[model samples]
Target: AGAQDFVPHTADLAELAAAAGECRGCGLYRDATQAVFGAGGRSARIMMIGEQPGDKEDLAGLPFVGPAGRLLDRALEAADIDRDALYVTNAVKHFKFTRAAGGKRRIHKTPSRTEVVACRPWLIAEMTSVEPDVVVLLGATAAKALLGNDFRVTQHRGEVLHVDVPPALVATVHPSSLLRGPKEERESAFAGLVDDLRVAADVR
Candidate 1:
């Protein structure tokens, strides 16, 4: 079983953030420093949701404020999008990782389907409140959580796909992926990320 559903109807993101910190809907919260909840302007028209919190984000108790976040910011700027005017979050509230058997550092592990479903309520609630015009799925995990299991970022990327959901969702690779790739591939990946983000700027 997953963690308990601790989310209550919230007045705003602040309330949601407060409530999410206590969420035990999944075991991920046990080892994570804190529940890193969504953050952005309340009236944002563009909402960007990622996979989950990273090392820096977990420590800061914020979303998209890490190395990956910087890459995302660069993309946004290149796309002529004001990131400060957008709502940013993740599919999971907690950082899911496993340390090596020996003395290795905590390594990120993708949250399982159980954890994603357990955390769905919070993401839904946030979306309902934020009401963005365009939703940007930053990686495969966020795409699967918001789009579907079969949605492939590589295939549908750079195209705006309208969904039953209120906002149009645009899928793209995560910024971290670009950073993790070989030096030769990094520029191409970054440009593609910026291009996908441009769709959001236009859509919103």
Candidate 2:
């Protein structure tokens, strides 16, 4: 019924990534290109989690390699955090989308709560492997994944909170939100993201 059965008991990220590719945890795998697993150094002290893979990520079989990912690259640079030093992943590893009739472009769709739960074992496994000191939730979906559905990112964004696994957790706006916002407010939106990331950097 979930990824629990498919997820290996091993703490090796590469093995987990391999097993994840064969996951039929939810219906998402049916339409998705592949499962995008958590990646980065095994000794990472910071773990960043997003919602799910985007168009480019799905196609490339990697997490956070798309437009939002690029924005995140800049945001981390602004916050003086090294992206290569952190483990990056998603709450849900598949790409959920809807396409117009006879159209080539696929519109992004939010993963349902059930899908998030189904994919959670992989996330937990990643936590086991990386054992990060801090977990930075990049948006509401990622926040809800660990902090519960009632957690409000709007009320607590940029605050350091203790969680069950990681020593600290920081919630922040997803880079995709900034990319989708109006041009006039985009700079400010990105600034807020960088500020939140700075908080994460300090705690990590």
Candidate 3:
């Protein structure tokens, strides 16, 4: 269950972003360094959403600037999408984690369904505000958050589908999975990511 303390609404991304750090929408904010809001193009045609911030992203107070982010950069570059052409952000702004390495380090945990729903209002606010033409869902968490629980990336990874709401939404695996995958599959997996990203570029 999430804490219902602050609910944010705005047509301006900057206002929504600044107020996020003080959000108590869910308990995920308790241990996180700060709320990492959506970033990139001010009014982009492509909005790329990830699960949540990783350790590096949380520490840096920005989304998609770490390892997965680096890999994403290369893939996006290969796809020919300019850095300023996309809005990169997370479905959930706070980091969800459990302790590992004897509690000395924090290990990421998939966010609970309740937590995802708790953050939906903000996601909606961004979708309406950013008004992207193509919304890229990175990984299962993001896919489920926007497309419902039954949505499967395996069946619809690169397909350009119309959303009943606004913009086109597509699902793709997150770059971190490729980095964490078996050695033999990394290349093919990376190729898959690049292939899907190219779809966003084409749509925009």
Candidate 4:
């Protein structure tokens, strides 16, 4: 079935979860463990969007439950944004990766544009169902998915961008990027992330 067949009903996160679990809207699902759907307060006022599921997330069959998620938890705590109150998910559900030496170790490969486009329907369904007051695009990939192809996190980071969705949208660096940078740069990057989250906190 096409994405349109899986319409999200209000107050039905479980149904949405199940539909996403069986999603075959794109080729990414072929190698993925399962679709990692969003998780958080059913009536969350804010929603956080990431690019896609990482290795740990793919294994766990959940979104943002990896190392990056841990760092996000810390950053959100510092920003005074309660994780329990926000819906967290990714623009794409499946984990894109390439097998390493002997085809044993899996190395993460970024999702292609076609993959992101094919998965957009699920993300749109999430926005339609959750109807949060504020939406935070956690990185460039998410920004590109929600805003447009031209979105540059470096140039537009910390700036709020309006969208047709219920949430007032904003963009920032991904937690993984922050964790991968030099110590000082990482700190700066995380601080910037917190700053952007603070804006989400301010939104009604």
* Highest lDDT model number: 2
**Candidate 3 at 142: error in angstroms?**
0.2
lDDT of 4 by residue, 161-181 (tens): 797653788898888887785
Off by over 4 Å in 1: 1-4, 101-105
Segments in model 2 whose C-alpha atoms lie over 4 Å from true places: 102-104
Of 1 and 4, the candidate ahead on TM-score is 1
Show the colliding residue pairs in model 4: none
Q: Write the number of the candidate with greater TM-score, choosing between 2 and 3.
A: 2
lDDT of 3 by residue, 1-204 (tens): 243345455668788888788888888989999998888756788899999998888898888988889999998888888867778888898999877666755678999888988987778778888888888899998988888978888889779977575488889998888888677799888888889988877885
Please rank every candidate by TM-score, starting with the best: 2, 1, 4, 3
Under the 3 Å rule for N, CA and C atoms, how many clashes does model 1 have? Answer: 3
- Evaluate all candidate structures by whole-model CA lDDT and list the values in order: 0.86, 0.89, 0.84, 0.83
Ranking by lDDT: 2, 1, 3, 4
For model 1, state the Cα shift of residue 112 in Å: 0.6
| Residue 193 displacement in candidate 1 (angstroms) | 0.7
Angstrom error at residue 152, model 1: 1.0
Model 1: per-residue Cα lDDT over 1-204, one tens digit each: 343358777648888888888888878989999999898866999999999998888899888887788988888888898877988999999999877788445678998878898898888888888998889999999999877877789999789887686488899999889878687799988989988888877884
Q: Estimate each model's TM-score.
A: 0.93, 0.95, 0.92, 0.92
Looking at candidate 1, the ten consecutive residues that score lowest on lDDT are: 1-10
> Which pairs clash (backbone N, Cα, C closer than 3 Å) in model 1?
3-25, 3-26, 4-25
Question: lDDT of candidate 3 vs native?
Answer: 0.84
